[PDB]
Scaffold this active site. Structure first.
Site: not given
Ligand SMILES: CC(C)NC(=O)N[C@H]1CC[C@H](Nc2ncc3ccc(=O)n(C4CCCC4)c3n2)CC1
Length: 340
Positions: A28, A31, A33, A145
């Site tokens: 999260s 912008q 969740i 950034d």
């Molecule tokens: C416990 C362990 C297994 N994983 C962990 O702690 N974090 C991972 C969990 C899976 C996440 N994948 C992912 N894919 C596409 C997107 C696209 C847009 C976006 O804004 N995000 C965010 C960035 C990071 C948070 C979400 C996306 N995140 C990466 C972070």
């Protein structure tokens, strides 16, 4: 009958198309969740981001609008791809939330930085970051950034950048959330104006942190951050400071001076794989690239193109809108982008 369904994911309520199954939260940001989910139509996993009332103020609206427009028309393997966009609301009057569907990645760069990384994977990650940045610059987008939290990777070491950075304008917020300023270039820190290699500084910060496993230039505000920069890299030359507005000239010239550190002292042999001749050389090259990216004066800093050409990295070689609007104006602009 209805082509949507709703489920609770923490505080939030995700109302999503029926194709998207088994939602699981995975982070999260500012912008909104973000959930992982299974896409029964594509037979693949996806990431779904909820934007709540993005039109609720200028700052959110410009960001949402920009991100939606850019993600749709920018097409590159190191920029996160938009798979689907929807709102469950049926009319402009009722319109509230926007859901963006993206390819699902395994981790943040933050997580990768904490690991011991060989040169093959460090240079590949950097290569990919530079290729992406290059693409953005060619499309008229200077990010400013770039940071590890907005860069994601897969287990196969594929790398994608998540966002398109700052608005050319730039603001006020209410939600208690802290912005990460550590990766911003001196010209952003000090307010100087910039060119494309403003993003190189950021890559330098990321690269350096991979080696040292500590944030290079922390601090509560730009005051502390500037102090950390000059304590390590030393005070910059007069030629540089002539390029600064009168008031920021006075500030910078009157801070306590520092000679700074040599790059071997900043990034000693200790921090590198350097056991085989292969690694000895790659370490040498790595520190040389670092020394060329982390320079205060952008006039002396390496360009993106010269960086991609650098021996550490080259082994891998192979409409406009930025204006003010009210809430109701923004709400409609975003709604119609969503209902393309
Ligand atoms: C416990 C362990 C297994 N994983 C962990 O702690 N974090 C991972 C969990 C899976 C996440 N994948 C992912 N894919 C596409 C997107 C696209 C847009 C976006 O804004 N995000 C965010 C960035 C990071 C948070 C979400 C996306 N995140 C990466 C972070």
């Amino acid at each position: 009958d209805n082509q949507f369904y709703s489920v609770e994911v923490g505080d939030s309520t995700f109302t999503v198309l029926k194709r998207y199954q088994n939602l699981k939260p995975i982070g999260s940001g500012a912008q909104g969740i973000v959930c992982a989910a299974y896409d029964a139509v594509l037979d693949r996993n996806v990431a779904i981001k909820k934007l709540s009332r993005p039109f609720q103020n200028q700052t959110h609206a410009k960001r949402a609008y920009r991100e939606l427009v850019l993600m749709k028309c920018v097409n590159h393997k190191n920029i996160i791809s938009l798979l689907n966009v929807f709102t469950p609301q049926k009319t402009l009057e009722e319109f509230q939330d926007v859901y963006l569907v993206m390819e699902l990645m395994d981790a943040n760069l933050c997580q990768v930085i904490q690991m011991e990384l060989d040169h093959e994977r460090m240079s590949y990650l950097l290569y990919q970051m530079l290729c992406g940045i290059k693409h953005l610059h060619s499309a008229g987008i200077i990010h400013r950034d770039l940071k590890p939290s907005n860069i994601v990777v897969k287990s196969d070491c594929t790398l994608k950048i998540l966002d398109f950075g700052l608005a050319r304008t730039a603001s006020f917020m209410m939600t208690p959330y802290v912005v990460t300023r550590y990766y911003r270039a001196p010209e952003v820190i000090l307010g100087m104006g910039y060119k494309e290699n403003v993003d190189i500084w950021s890559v330098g910060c990321i690269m350096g942190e991979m080696v040292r496993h500590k944030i290079l230039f922390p601090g509560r505000d730009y005051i502390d951050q500037w102090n950390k920069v000059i304590e390590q890299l030393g005070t910059p030359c007069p030629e540089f400071m002539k390029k600064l507005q009168p008031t920021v000239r006075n500030y910078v010239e009157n801070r306590p001076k520092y000679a700074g550190l040599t790059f071997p002292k900043l990034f000693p042999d200790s921090l590198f794989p350097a056991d085989s001749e292969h690694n000895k050389l790659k370490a040498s090259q790595a520190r040389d690239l670092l020394s060329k990216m982390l320079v205060i004066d952008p006039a002396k800093r390496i360009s993106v193109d010269d960086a991609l050409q650098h021996p550490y990295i080259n082994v891998w070689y192979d409409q406009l809108d930025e204006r003010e609007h009210t809430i109701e104006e923004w709400k409609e602009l975003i709604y119609k982008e969503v209902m393309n």
